[PDB]
């Protein structure tokens, strides 16, 4: 390094995070004005599917961090009469926008500002989780802060999106949701308050932007709330046992910490209710909740949909004596809770939906919050050729894209050859008349071995078939978080 003085930017880390063709930065900035297709797009799929990747603009300042913290990249690829095109941006975040002012790094460990470089950016966001068309534009989100607005079309950054002030908690999640009767937006803070506090919020949106309602609360501790689940009548967090303490972060040490002998815990409220209105329920120890496939309530019970798996899955957030399992070790699978708001107990388990691990689950967005019968679920399975010219096994490798039949319980899936891997999937319904889950689906497709990138496009009528259209992109797309499809 001494040989290099200090005016070239110093290399990236060489560590898994950095590496192979899912975690290699990127930083591309780009637009695509038509996009290759082999096979036959249908013409009538209009509107476009954005995407938020965490794309480093520059090597971290401590030479190592984590996927979850690089700069938000928004990708469009606008379909319309068959044809595809592609732009893609980063979020002017004003953190970004400092690093850019001093050609480097200022931001330190994840979600910790204590260790940022004194002339970093005061707001630590990097918007970089998920993205959601509201009021006009799309919000790129993530749970540390208030989201940031972007042109639906151009993906300027519009600014931090503040609801015409009326969000006053101190974050906003990044799974909120869209009510398919209404198209409120339906979101949520956690540490709500600042750092390590307990509080949580439910916040109703209507479209037009108009805060409906606002349920603050808090919990028994501070905890990580990633995604949450809302019904026709009631909002459910799961409280994950990953734990806030600020004197660890004082001291450089990560904003959570696994404790495996804290009981998974869920709050559930009415949509329309009050604080003492919450319940509280918990579930085993030593496990975490994933992200919600669906919920939906009837009578006295609400039910959540999501894979739980059995143990500590961030190595970034390891219990105090500093123990991680093996990913490999822990049992996950798709489950579902009921929470009996009538009954004596307490103590929920989950019961399995399917018997494979799965993540990034899509349901038909017309079905959010109703009863429903069917997803769609990203899966690996170990027992598929891998070629080896992919590299080792990066983390949030997928190597199947499944419809799951929750009716029959039988799952369709693709497997895309053994050097290939999936994102975050969207579904994009037929008609506007169509039958639930009848439709498109559309992934990006990582061929690791050549570090290319298709954006594929399976009929949900036979999802074994394989694509009926792949979108050929000239680069490679880094791995992703979430997306959404966006109608014309
Ligand atoms: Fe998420």
Known sequence: LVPRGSHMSIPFPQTPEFSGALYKPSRIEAEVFDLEIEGVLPASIHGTFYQVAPDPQYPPMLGTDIFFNGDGMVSGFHFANGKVSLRRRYVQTDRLLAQRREGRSLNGVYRNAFTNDSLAAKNNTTANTSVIPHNGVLLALKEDALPWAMDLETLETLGEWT?????????????????????????????????????????????????????????????????????????????????????????????????????????????????????????????????????????????????????????????????????ETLAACLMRWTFDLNSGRDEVEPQPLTDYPCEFPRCDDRYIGRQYAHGFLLAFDPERPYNPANGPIPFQFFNLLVHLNLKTGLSDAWFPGDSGCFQEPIFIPRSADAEEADGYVVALLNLIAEERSELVVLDSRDMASGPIARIRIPFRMRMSLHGCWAPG
């Open 163 to 327: 609801f015409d002030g009326q969000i006053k908690s101190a974050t906003f999640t990044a799974h909120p949701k869209l009510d398919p009767a209404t198209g409120n937006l339906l979101a949520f803070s956690y540490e709500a308050k600042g750092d390590g506090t307990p509080d949580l919020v439910y916040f109703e949106l209507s479209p037009d932007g108009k805060l409906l309602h606002e349920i603050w609360f808090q919990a028994p501790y501070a905890a990580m709330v990633h995604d949450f689940a809302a019904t026709e009548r009631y909002v459910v967090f799961p409280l994950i046992p990953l734990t806030v303490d600020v004197e660890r972060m004082k001291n450089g040490g990560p904003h959570f910490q696994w404790q495996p002998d804290l009981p998974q815990l869920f709050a559930v409220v009415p949509r329309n209710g009050r604080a003492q209105d919450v319940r509280w329920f918990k579930g085993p120890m030593d496990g975490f909740q994933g992200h919600t496939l669906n919920a939906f309530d009837e009578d006295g019970k609400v039910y959540v949909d999501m894979p739980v798996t059995g143990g500590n899955i961030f190595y970034f957030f390891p219990q105090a004596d500093g123990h991680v399992p093996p990913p």
